[PDB]
Amino acid sequence: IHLENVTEEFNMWKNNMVEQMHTDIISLWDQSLKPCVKLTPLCVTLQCTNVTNNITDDMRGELKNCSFNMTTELRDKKQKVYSLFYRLDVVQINSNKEYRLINCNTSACTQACPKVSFEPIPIHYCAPAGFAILKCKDKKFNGTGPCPSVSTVQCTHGIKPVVSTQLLLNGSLAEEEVMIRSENITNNAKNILVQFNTPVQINCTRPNNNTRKSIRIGPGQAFYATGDIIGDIRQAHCNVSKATWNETLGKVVKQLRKHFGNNTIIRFANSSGGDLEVTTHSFNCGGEFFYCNTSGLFNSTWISNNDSITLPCRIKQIINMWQRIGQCMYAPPIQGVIRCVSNITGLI
Amino acid sequence: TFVSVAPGQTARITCGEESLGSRSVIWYQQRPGQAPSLIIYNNNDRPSGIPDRFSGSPGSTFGTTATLTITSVEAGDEADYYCHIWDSRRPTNWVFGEGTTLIVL
Amino acid sequence: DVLMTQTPLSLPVSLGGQASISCRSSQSVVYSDGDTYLEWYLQKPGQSPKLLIYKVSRRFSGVPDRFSGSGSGTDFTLKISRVETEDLGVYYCFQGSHVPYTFGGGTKLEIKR
Amino acid sequence: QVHLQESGPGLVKPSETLSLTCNVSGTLVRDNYWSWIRQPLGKQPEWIGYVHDSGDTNYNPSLKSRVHLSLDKSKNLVSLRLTGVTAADSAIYYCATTKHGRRIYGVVAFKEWFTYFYMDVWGKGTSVTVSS
Amino acid sequence: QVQLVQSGAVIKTPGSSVKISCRASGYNFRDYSIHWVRLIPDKGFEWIGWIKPLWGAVSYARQLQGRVSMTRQLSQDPDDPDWGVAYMEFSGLTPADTAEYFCVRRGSCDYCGDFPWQYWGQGTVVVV
Amino acid sequence: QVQLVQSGAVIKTPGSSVKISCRASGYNFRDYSIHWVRLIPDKGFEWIGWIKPLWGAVSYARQLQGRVSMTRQLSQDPDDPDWGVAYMEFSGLTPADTAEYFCVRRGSCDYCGDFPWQYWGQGTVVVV
Ligand SMILES: *[C@@H]1O[C@H](CO)[C@@H](O[C@@H]2O[C@H](CO)[C@@H](O[C@@H]3O[C@H](CO[C@H]4O[C@H](CO[C@H]5O[C@H](CO)[C@@H](O)[C@H](O)[C@@H]5O)[C@@H](O)[C@H](O[C@H]5O[C@H](CO)[C@@H](O)[C@H](O)[C@@H]5O)[C@@H]4O)[C@@H](O)[C@H](O[C@H]4O[C@H](CO)[C@@H](O)[C@H](O)[C@@H]4O[C@H]4O[C@H](CO)[C@@H](O)[C@H](O)[C@@H]4O[C@H]4O[C@H](CO)[C@@H](O)[C@H](O)[C@@H]4O)[C@@H]3O)[C@H](O)[C@H]2NC(C)=O)[C@H](O)[C@H]1NC(C)=O
Ligand SMILES: *[C@@H]1O[C@H](CO)[C@@H](O[C@@H]2O[C@H](CO)[C@@H](O[C@@H]3O[C@H](CO[C@H]4O[C@H](CO)[C@@H](O)[C@H](O[C@H]5O[C@H](CO)[C@@H](O)[C@H](O)[C@@H]5O)[C@@H]4O)[C@@H](O)[C@H](O[C@H]4O[C@H](CO)[C@@H](O)[C@H](O)[C@@H]4O[C@H]4O[C@H](CO)[C@@H](O)[C@H](O)[C@@H]4O[C@H]4O[C@H](CO)[C@@H](O)[C@H](O)[C@@H]4O)[C@@H]3O)[C@H](O)[C@H]2NC(C)=O)[C@H](O)[C@H]1NC(C)=O
Ligand SMILES: *[C@@H]1O[C@H](CO)[C@@H](O[C@@H]2O[C@H](CO)[C@@H](O[C@@H]3O[C@H](CO[C@H]4O[C@H](CO)[C@@H](O)[C@H](O)[C@@H]4O)[C@@H](O)[C@H](O[C@H]4O[C@H](CO)[C@@H](O)[C@H](O)[C@@H]4O[C@H]4O[C@H](CO)[C@@H](O)[C@H](O)[C@@H]4O)[C@@H]3O)[C@H](O)[C@H]2NC(C)=O)[C@H](O)[C@H]1NC(C)=O
Ligand SMILES: *[C@@H]1O[C@H](CO)[C@@H](O[C@@H]2O[C@H](CO)[C@@H](O[C@@H]3O[C@H](CO[C@H]4O[C@H](CO)[C@@H](O)[C@H](O)[C@@H]4O)[C@@H](O)[C@H](O[C@H]4O[C@H](CO)[C@@H](O)[C@H](O)[C@@H]4O)[C@@H]3O)[C@H](O)[C@H]2NC(C)=O)[C@H](O)[C@H]1NC(C)=O
Ligand SMILES: *[C@@H]1O[C@H](CO)[C@@H](O[C@@H]2O[C@H](CO)[C@@H](O[C@@H]3O[C@H](CO[C@H]4O[C@H](CO)[C@@H](O)[C@H](O)[C@@H]4O)[C@@H](O)[C@H](O)[C@@H]3O)[C@H](O)[C@H]2NC(C)=O)[C@H](O)[C@H]1NC(C)=O
Ligand SMILES: *[C@@H]1O[C@H](CO)[C@@H](O[C@@H]2O[C@H](CO)[C@@H](O[C@@H]3O[C@H](CO)[C@@H](O)[C@H](O)[C@@H]3O)[C@H](O)[C@H]2NC(C)=O)[C@H](O)[C@H]1NC(C)=O
Ligand SMILES: *[C@@H]1O[C@H](CO)[C@@H](O[C@@H]2O[C@H](CO)[C@@H](O[C@@H]3O[C@H](CO)[C@@H](O)[C@H](O)[C@@H]3O)[C@H](O)[C@H]2NC(C)=O)[C@H](O)[C@H]1NC(C)=O
Ligand SMILES: *[C@@H]1O[C@H](CO)[C@@H](O[C@@H]2O[C@H](CO)[C@@H](O)[C@H](O)[C@H]2NC(C)=O)[C@H](O)[C@H]1NC(C)=O
Ligand SMILES: *[C@@H]1O[C@H](CO)[C@@H](O[C@@H]2O[C@H](CO)[C@@H](O)[C@H](O)[C@H]2NC(C)=O)[C@H](O)[C@H]1NC(C)=O
Ligand SMILES: *[C@@H]1O[C@H](CO)[C@@H](O[C@@H]2O[C@H](CO)[C@@H](O)[C@H](O)[C@H]2NC(C)=O)[C@H](O)[C@H]1NC(C)=O
Ligand SMILES: *[C@@H]1O[C@H](CO)[C@@H](O[C@@H]2O[C@H](CO)[C@@H](O)[C@H](O)[C@H]2NC(C)=O)[C@H](O)[C@H]1NC(C)=O
Ligand SMILES: *[C@@H]1O[C@H](CO)[C@@H](O)[C@H](O)[C@H]1NC(C)=O
């Protein structure tokens, strides 16, 4: 319901309820891992080898074919069983070539239950009795200072939780302009949240056809490995359109020149460095994590006056989200060729 | 490995290893005492000189064996056939497949 | 601002022919009572704008058996069987959902020739 | 209209460098790839490899050292040198033209394609035999 | 306490690459950014870059790009989560780069910015 | 969705015993009963029995006792608790038993009975 003649100053940067949501989603992410299977019995010597594939010395395969002993239902007996792993999940311990998983020396790992999914469902945050939620209905609003048109509301609108580092996906579009947002633009340690009007459609896919393979560890314990690759061994990627992306970069240059002078050259670059899930944008697509390189998008320079971009991905199977000390998640493989469609909404 | 099917009938001559990825098979034939001669240069593509009815299995199929289908056979079809598979996963085959022999009544 | 969009703008339709006007919102039109408040209108030159439909498909008393509203959520569409000389002019969408109220962009109905 | 013609010794004493030549007819040596194939008696052929100008000279890695392919742009011929003839080398050998072509199965820029070869016309053969 | 311990002063040659470590202890190392600053005689201070040790996202000074590189090492045990190490590989050494280098951390107050560098390393003198 | 997948149509001899499976998917299989019904030309429908897949308690038509038998197979994994299989061994085959067989499930509404059979298998034709 609308509320007139009112001037409440807002602040998204010293805002609460983004602090407690960041606490709540981490805590609930942990609460969806207690019924699941621990991979304590799987930290073991691996006897890995190259996958059956045409091999060139210069090129490096992204997959390894690892055989290993594994326990069974019966404590006396054990079984030789093989799986397929990525390069990023195994390291070499040191003729022969025997590996192990990377997280073995720091943390026992937890398989995600394949029954539960990772897709966003929209949360509506609701105020309890004796409080209220105000909403800035203003159009041109950098999130700091007076909002002339506020309105109370029972609950917030649909907030779908996306996990993404760069290029935040499936978000809320702006009304008419493209709005950049910062706490102090003359400072550089604070990020610049960009939100643009017309979304850029991104198409990400994995052309491999995986077969999973249930491996019993113990009584009522199932480890979902990767069986054979059926078809061509290919590299996953994402596609955006060249025209719409160059158009939205033109829009964000046009809006970034409001704070930096009109006679200013604005160029982009790729990331300076860091861990894999901050040098490039990570996301989830149908239950599998992509780390998809963005040096193709953010390469431009701008002067004061049916194609597409194929940008390549990588897939980890273990993750270390929010960088804890003893927590990881072995994401299980999923059947078939996987693809999804998302609307890029904003930037960081 | 000899297959004969009365003249004018059909014949399905398989050759080579079962597929792993995408393939570009090449079918040759060999009249006795002569040089070879190409009949099929892609999965289902033929050059000039060789007529139709010499169909080939497509390379899009995963985990099947390369076949060569002939309808309305003749005594000129009676020769030694050869396959040369080019899989997108297995390395380069510098030697051809196994010699398959056709006979006719 | 729940700014409305009307597609298409102009519609040359011969008299007796069919016509349909689509409207799209930027938010849901749903109010707390469950009744989304959409109001399809009239305009003729030299006259005041008038009602056609005051709800989703609940037309005003004084409308013949040709006009109907339809749609859901954010996407809505008008339906007219036969176009008359009285059915000419400019039509409009409108939200009575929540303050501020917004109109559309106007749709002119003409005759094919 | 092309047809080839090989020429060689035919009688080979062992541990001796075998050499062969191949004439042309119609199409010259620059205009196409070249390839050498061997076939034993009652056996499938063995594609020894291919030669072309600008480094397109890959060999069978089984032999890989005792075989050297060559051209003749002065006289417009093709030639071959072999090294260390054993008893298995008695086979009928073939110079032939071949044609490339890209089988593309995925993204082009990600090198998800390969080039197959196919020999369209052939030589006529030299029944090389090793004997003492 | 909040402690920042660097490495000893080092003598390098022109064209070499120096690696300087900065061990931090006494706080949750994943939370606060680490800045690097230099002190040149007759030139004053000059900023080099920052690193956020949670993922390792860095940002460099514009006129030092291509030469500098910053990495970190976290503590992965449920007993000592406090300590951590930052690094700086400063490469393309010239005789002008003879200077004293500092690794700094901001304060912990509410109105503290990022650049009000509260805690300071003891400094490492690099002579080329 | 709620899916019921039967087996293919089968040809049997008099005096034999047919086994027909009914795989169910898309709901918690332990909750809802599975009924079996037959369709004979010039005779209409006829009920065969039900099975409650929680324990396997069955009930048969009175004029088919001694001939029919019904079993089930549950899903024992914490990943796919949804699917399940029902079976029907129909024995003492006569030439009159040439018919199309259906395995059905009731609805999920509150006023739904047991016999308002909402979901239907595609049918299996048995010719003797
Ligand atoms: C994000 O974007 C990126 C790019 O931006 C996307 O990446 C693309 O992804 C697709 C699929 O993932 C890839 O497609 C493959 O492409 C190859 C190459 O296609 C080209 O070459 C064909 C043949 O070349 C001939 O013609 C050209 C001139 O046209 C000539 O230069 C050449 O010398 C030769 O003469 C062309 O036909 C083809 O054109 C096709 O597409 C045109 C585009 O619109 C269209 O106009 C045409 O009409 C035609 O349809 C193109 O120029 C394809 O060959 C390949 O398809 C084969 O391989 C797969 C492998 O499994 C198989 O499933 C297919 O069925 C097909 O296999 C048939 O063809 C084989 C050819 O030898 C044959 O051996 C097989 O046996 C099989 O043949 C059987 O069936 C056919 C009928 O189907 C029949 O004719 C045969 O006789 C036999 O019965 C793939 O389609 C792209 O390469 C890739 N990159 C680019 C740059 O596009 C990415 O997907 C995007 N991501 C997302 C999520 O959207
Ligand atoms: C999954 O779990 C599986 C279950 O454990 C596991 O399988 C086991 O893996 C181990 C290690 O890979 C195997 O040990 C090896 O066994 C080889 C096979 O030999 C067996 O079979 C023969 C019949 O063919 C028997 O005759 C033979 O018995 C004889 O030899 C014994 C050796 O001690 C001796 O004690 C007996 O009295 C008898 O005389 C045996 O039962 C065996 O050959 C191998 O020894 C060498 O041989 C290999 C070449 O074939 C080498 O590549 C290999 O590396 C070994 O070299 C050793 O010796 C060299 C020269 O002295 C040294 O330089 C090397 O460093 C190395 O020395 C190491 O090994 C010595 C024992 O051999 C040891 O004394 C040294 O101190 C040093 O540690 C080796 O013994 C075992 O057999 C497997 N069991 C089964 C059932 O398969 C599997 O690996 C797991 N992973 C996967 C992916 O499946
Ligand atoms: C940004 O926002 C977009 C918009 O939502 C979003 O795209 C959507 O992503 C989801 C998740 O990846 C997609 O949902 C999957 O869709 C396929 C296709 O089936 C659906 O669509 C057809 C036609 O539209 C319908 O007929 C059909 O009924 C479905 O609705 C399904 O295969 C997927 O189902 C599996 O996963 C579910 C996860 O909960 C399970 O509940 C389900 O039962 C399936 O899992 C089971 O089956 C597998 C195969 O047998 C088996 O291997 C599993 O182990 C398990 O047993 C799923 O419904 C949706 O289609 C996308 N929408 C569009 C338009 O593309 C983007 O993902 C989002 N971006 C980001 C980054 O999140
Ligand atoms: C990752 O690496 C592992 C390494 O262990 C691979 O696992 C082995 O893969 C090979 C080849 O893919 C398999 O070998 C094949 O086995 C088939 C089935 O085995 C039965 O038959 C053999 C008789 O050959 C019996 O000894 C055995 O006990 C089984 O009863 C065979 O049918 C195959 O034979 C075919 O190919 C050979 C090639 O020489 C021909 O000579 C034959 O005539 C026939 O055409 C072949 O032997 C092996 O079984 C796999 N082991 C296991 C334990 O599964 C993975 O495949 C690999 N994965 C990937 C993705 O690369
Ligand atoms: C648990 O075990 C994991 C597997 O061993 C550890 O992960 C790897 O640990 C090494 C450290 O031993 C990291 O660094 C590597 O070090 C070697 C040798 O270091 C020398 O070279 C580097 C090059 O810059 C130099 O900086 C050093 O000072 C040494 O002079 C190098 O050859 C490697 O290239 C690499 O630099 C690895 O980075 C690390 N792996 C990953 C993926 O980060 C892990 O540290 C262990 N954790 C615990 C708590 O024990
Ligand atoms: C982001 O937008 C907000 C408003 O939506 C900006 O806040 C206000 O910005 C104006 C200038 O645009 C500031 O006015 C200045 O005030 C001082 C003292 O009053 C005066 O001396 C100057 O001449 C000028 O008029 C105003 O103070 C400021 N208000 C607040 C609370 O910050 C904000 O500046 C925008 N962000 C950036 C980085 O510009
Ligand atoms: C941002 O873009 C630049 C240039 O487009 C990228 O720099 C390039 O990075 C690659 C790999 O990191 C360098 O390749 C070489 O790889 C071999 C592998 O063994 C290694 O031995 C070499 O030392 C080098 O790493 C390439 O030379 C380099 N090019 C330049 C001009 O610096 C940079 O990686 C991009 N940033 C991100 C985060 O991707
Ligand atoms: C099998 O895989 C191993 C490694 O997994 C290969 O060994 C090296 O691989 C790298 C890239 O994967 C190449 O740059 C090296 O040149 C390889 N080493 C050697 C000595 O060549 C190995 O080549 C693969 N193939 C085989 C047949 O072992
Ligand atoms: C990935 O490979 C599997 C291999 O089983 C394919 O599944 C088969 O698909 C064919 C064609 O639709 C069916 O007739 C088989 O019954 C399927 N078998 C199984 C076990 O599912 C699957 O279609 C492939 N996926 C893609 C995208 O090609
Ligand atoms: C992303 O994938 C979608 C498919 O879901 C593409 O949308 C279709 O693209 C084809 C072009 O081949 C058009 O003919 C269809 O009309 C499109 N459908 C829809 C609903 O838009 C889309 O083009 C892809 N995006 C990029 C950048 O490649
Ligand atoms: C960033 O964009 C530039 C051009 O905008 C790309 O530059 C290309 O560089 C190669 C050299 O390897 C030249 O052959 C091309 O002609 C250049 N492109 C153009 C359009 O001139 C550069 O590749 C892009 N960055 C990345 C990482 O792809
Ligand atoms: C920036 O550009 C706008 C129009 O693009 C102009 O109105 C404004 O005066 C310019 N400001 C400066 C400082 O150049």
PDB file of N, CA, C and O in Angstrom, chain A residues 210-241:
ATOM      1  N   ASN A 210      27.211 -37.985 -19.869  1.00  0.00           N
ATOM      2  CA  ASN A 210      27.702 -38.789 -18.763  1.00  0.00           C
ATOM      3  C   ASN A 210      26.748 -39.922 -18.426  1.00  0.00           C
ATOM      4  O   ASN A 210      25.536 -39.834 -18.630  1.00  0.00           O
ATOM      5  N   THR A 211      27.321 -40.997 -17.901  1.00  0.00           N
ATOM      6  CA  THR A 211      26.578 -42.096 -17.309  1.00  0.00           C
ATOM      7  C   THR A 211      27.010 -42.201 -15.859  1.00  0.00           C
ATOM      8  O   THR A 211      28.201 -42.369 -15.586  1.00  0.00           O
ATOM      9  N   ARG A 212      26.069 -42.076 -14.930  1.00  0.00           N
ATOM     10  CA  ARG A 212      26.492 -42.255 -13.553  1.00  0.00           C
ATOM     11  C   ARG A 212      26.552 -43.739 -13.222  1.00  0.00           C
ATOM     12  O   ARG A 212      26.104 -44.598 -13.984  1.00  0.00           O
ATOM     13  N   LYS A 213      27.113 -44.035 -12.058  1.00  0.00           N
ATOM     14  CA  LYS A 213      27.383 -45.413 -11.671  1.00  0.00           C
ATOM     15  C   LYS A 213      27.310 -45.471 -10.156  1.00  0.00           C
ATOM     16  O   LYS A 213      28.145 -44.869  -9.477  1.00  0.00           O
ATOM     17  N   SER A 214      26.317 -46.169  -9.628  1.00  0.00           N
ATOM     18  CA  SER A 214      26.193 -46.290  -8.187  1.00  0.00           C
ATOM     19  C   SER A 214      27.222 -47.276  -7.667  1.00  0.00           C
ATOM     20  O   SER A 214      27.253 -48.437  -8.081  1.00  0.00           O
ATOM     21  N   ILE A 215      28.071 -46.808  -6.764  1.00  0.00           N
ATOM     22  CA  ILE A 215      29.063 -47.637  -6.100  1.00  0.00           C
ATOM     23  C   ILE A 215      28.679 -47.703  -4.634  1.00  0.00           C
ATOM     24  O   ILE A 215      28.608 -46.670  -3.962  1.00  0.00           O
ATOM     25  N   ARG A 216      28.419 -48.907  -4.141  1.00  0.00           N
ATOM     26  CA  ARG A 216      28.103 -49.053  -2.729  1.00  0.00           C
ATOM     27  C   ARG A 216      29.368 -48.933  -1.897  1.00  0.00           C
ATOM     28  O   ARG A 216      30.384 -49.563  -2.195  1.00  0.00           O
ATOM     29  N   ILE A 217      29.303 -48.114  -0.854  1.00  0.00           N
ATOM     30  CA  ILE A 217      30.386 -47.972   0.100  1.00  0.00           C
ATOM     31  C   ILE A 217      30.163 -48.853   1.319  1.00  0.00           C
ATOM     32  O   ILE A 217      31.066 -49.576   1.746  1.00  0.00           O
ATOM     33  N   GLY A 218      28.954 -48.829   1.864  1.00  0.00           N
ATOM     34  CA  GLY A 218      28.598 -49.593   3.031  1.00  0.00           C
ATOM     35  C   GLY A 218      27.120 -49.905   3.003  1.00  0.00           C
ATOM     36  O   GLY A 218      26.473 -49.837   1.953  1.00  0.00           O
ATOM     37  N   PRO A 219      26.560 -50.295   4.143  1.00  0.00           N
ATOM     38  CA  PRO A 219      25.111 -50.498   4.213  1.00  0.00           C
ATOM     39  C   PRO A 219      24.369 -49.179   4.068  1.00  0.00           C
ATOM     40  O   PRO A 219      24.542 -48.259   4.869  1.00  0.00           O
ATOM     41  N   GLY A 220      23.516 -49.110   3.050  1.00  0.00           N
ATOM     42  CA  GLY A 220      22.776 -47.895   2.756  1.00  0.00           C
ATOM     43  C   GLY A 220      23.627 -46.718   2.338  1.00  0.00           C
ATOM     44  O   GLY A 220      23.230 -45.570   2.552  1.00  0.00           O
ATOM     45  N   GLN A 221      24.781 -46.969   1.732  1.00  0.00           N
ATOM     46  CA  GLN A 221      25.698 -45.914   1.329  1.00  0.00           C
ATOM     47  C   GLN A 221      25.956 -46.051  -0.160  1.00  0.00           C
ATOM     48  O   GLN A 221      26.443 -47.090  -0.611  1.00  0.00           O
ATOM     49  N   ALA A 222      25.650 -45.007  -0.919  1.00  0.00           N
ATOM     50  CA  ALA A 222      25.830 -45.033  -2.361  1.00  0.00           C
ATOM     51  C   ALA A 222      26.668 -43.846  -2.794  1.00  0.00           C
ATOM     52  O   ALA A 222      26.340 -42.699  -2.478  1.00  0.00           O
ATOM     53  N   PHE A 223      27.742 -44.124  -3.522  1.00  0.00           N
ATOM     54  CA  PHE A 223      28.593 -43.103  -4.113  1.00  0.00           C
ATOM     55  C   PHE A 223      28.333 -43.064  -5.609  1.00  0.00           C
ATOM     56  O   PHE A 223      28.475 -44.082  -6.292  1.00  0.00           O
ATOM     57  N   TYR A 224      27.962 -41.894  -6.112  1.00  0.00           N
ATOM     58  CA  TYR A 224      27.572 -41.735  -7.510  1.00  0.00           C
ATOM     59  C   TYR A 224      28.777 -41.240  -8.291  1.00  0.00           C
ATOM     60  O   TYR A 224      29.136 -40.064  -8.227  1.00  0.00           O
ATOM     61  N   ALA A 225      29.413 -42.147  -9.018  1.00  0.00           N
ATOM     62  CA  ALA A 225      30.596 -41.841  -9.796  1.00  0.00           C
ATOM     63  C   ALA A 225      30.214 -41.550 -11.241  1.00  0.00           C
ATOM     64  O   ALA A 225      29.039 -41.502 -11.602  1.00  0.00           O
ATOM     65  N   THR A 226      31.217 -41.349 -12.085  1.00  0.00           N
ATOM     66  CA  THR A 226      31.013 -41.171 -13.515  1.00  0.00           C
ATOM     67  C   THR A 226      31.431 -42.441 -14.236  1.00  0.00           C
ATOM     68  O   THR A 226      32.585 -42.863 -14.132  1.00  0.00           O
ATOM     69  N   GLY A 227      30.509 -43.034 -14.980  1.00  0.00           N
ATOM     70  CA  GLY A 227      30.848 -44.197 -15.773  1.00  0.00           C
ATOM     71  C   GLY A 227      31.480 -43.804 -17.089  1.00  0.00           C
ATOM     72  O   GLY A 227      32.413 -43.003 -17.116  1.00  0.00           O
ATOM     73  N   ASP A 228      30.987 -44.356 -18.187  1.00  0.00           N
ATOM     74  CA  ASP A 228      31.576 -44.095 -19.488  1.00  0.00           C
ATOM     75  C   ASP A 228      31.052 -42.778 -20.060  1.00  0.00           C
ATOM     76  O   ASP A 228      29.966 -42.308 -19.720  1.00  0.00           O
ATOM     77  N   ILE A 229      31.858 -42.176 -20.933  1.00  0.00           N
ATOM     78  CA  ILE A 229      31.405 -41.090 -21.790  1.00  0.00           C
ATOM     79  C   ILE A 229      30.841 -41.713 -23.052  1.00  0.00           C
ATOM     80  O   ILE A 229      31.519 -42.505 -23.717  1.00  0.00           O
ATOM     81  N   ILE A 230      29.618 -41.356 -23.398  1.00  0.00           N
ATOM     82  CA  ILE A 230      28.963 -41.909 -24.571  1.00  0.00           C
ATOM     83  C   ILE A 230      28.907 -40.802 -25.608  1.00  0.00           C
ATOM     84  O   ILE A 230      28.080 -39.890 -25.524  1.00  0.00           O
ATOM     85  N   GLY A 231      29.806 -40.871 -26.589  1.00  0.00           N
ATOM     86  CA  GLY A 231      29.881 -39.873 -27.631  1.00  0.00           C
ATOM     87  C   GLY A 231      31.213 -39.145 -27.616  1.00  0.00           C
ATOM     88  O   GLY A 231      32.233 -39.690 -27.180  1.00  0.00           O
ATOM     89  N   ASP A 232      31.188 -37.911 -28.101  1.00  0.00           N
ATOM     90  CA  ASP A 232      32.406 -37.139 -28.272  1.00  0.00           C
ATOM     91  C   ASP A 232      32.817 -36.478 -26.966  1.00  0.00           C
ATOM     92  O   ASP A 232      31.982 -35.938 -26.238  1.00  0.00           O
ATOM     93  N   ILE A 233      34.112 -36.524 -26.670  1.00  0.00           N
ATOM     94  CA  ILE A 233      34.662 -35.774 -25.548  1.00  0.00           C
ATOM     95  C   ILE A 233      34.854 -34.337 -26.006  1.00  0.00           C
ATOM     96  O   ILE A 233      35.666 -34.061 -26.890  1.00  0.00           O
ATOM     97  N   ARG A 234      34.104 -33.422 -25.407  1.00  0.00           N
ATOM     98  CA  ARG A 234      34.095 -32.029 -25.810  1.00  0.00           C
ATOM     99  C   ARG A 234      34.255 -31.144 -24.585  1.00  0.00           C
ATOM    100  O   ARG A 234      34.247 -31.614 -23.446  1.00  0.00           O
ATOM    101  N   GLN A 235      34.402 -29.848 -24.828  1.00  0.00           N
ATOM    102  CA  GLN A 235      34.604 -28.872 -23.767  1.00  0.00           C
ATOM    103  C   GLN A 235      33.361 -28.009 -23.626  1.00  0.00           C
ATOM    104  O   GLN A 235      32.837 -27.505 -24.623  1.00  0.00           O
ATOM    105  N   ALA A 236      32.896 -27.848 -22.392  1.00  0.00           N
ATOM    106  CA  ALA A 236      31.703 -27.068 -22.114  1.00  0.00           C
ATOM    107  C   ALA A 236      31.966 -25.585 -22.338  1.00  0.00           C
ATOM    108  O   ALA A 236      33.106 -25.121 -22.315  1.00  0.00           O
ATOM    109  N   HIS A 237      30.888 -24.835 -22.546  1.00  0.00           N
ATOM    110  CA  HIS A 237      31.008 -23.436 -22.925  1.00  0.00           C
ATOM    111  C   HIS A 237      29.717 -22.705 -22.596  1.00  0.00           C
ATOM    112  O   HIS A 237      28.730 -23.300 -22.164  1.00  0.00           O
ATOM    113  N   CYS A 238      29.745 -21.393 -22.814  1.00  0.00           N
ATOM    114  CA  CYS A 238      28.574 -20.538 -22.717  1.00  0.00           C
ATOM    115  C   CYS A 238      28.518 -19.637 -23.939  1.00  0.00           C
ATOM    116  O   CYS A 238      29.544 -19.308 -24.533  1.00  0.00           O
ATOM    117  N   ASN A 239      27.307 -19.239 -24.313  1.00  0.00           N
ATOM    118  CA  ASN A 239      27.098 -18.378 -25.465  1.00  0.00           C
ATOM    119  C   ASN A 239      26.281 -17.167 -25.063  1.00  0.00           C
ATOM    120  O   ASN A 239      25.251 -17.299 -24.398  1.00  0.00           O
ATOM    121  N   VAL A 240      26.747 -15.990 -25.466  1.00  0.00           N
ATOM    122  CA  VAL A 240      25.940 -14.783 -25.480  1.00  0.00           C
ATOM    123  C   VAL A 240      25.951 -14.255 -26.902  1.00  0.00           C
ATOM    124  O   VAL A 240      26.780 -14.642 -27.727  1.00  0.00           O
ATOM    125  N   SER A 241      25.019 -13.360 -27.186  1.00  0.00           N
ATOM    126  CA  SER A 241      24.953 -12.737 -28.495  1.00  0.00           C
ATOM    127  C   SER A 241      25.891 -11.545 -28.535  1.00  0.00           C
ATOM    128  O   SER A 241      26.014 -10.807 -27.557  1.00  0.00           O
TER     129      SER A 241
END
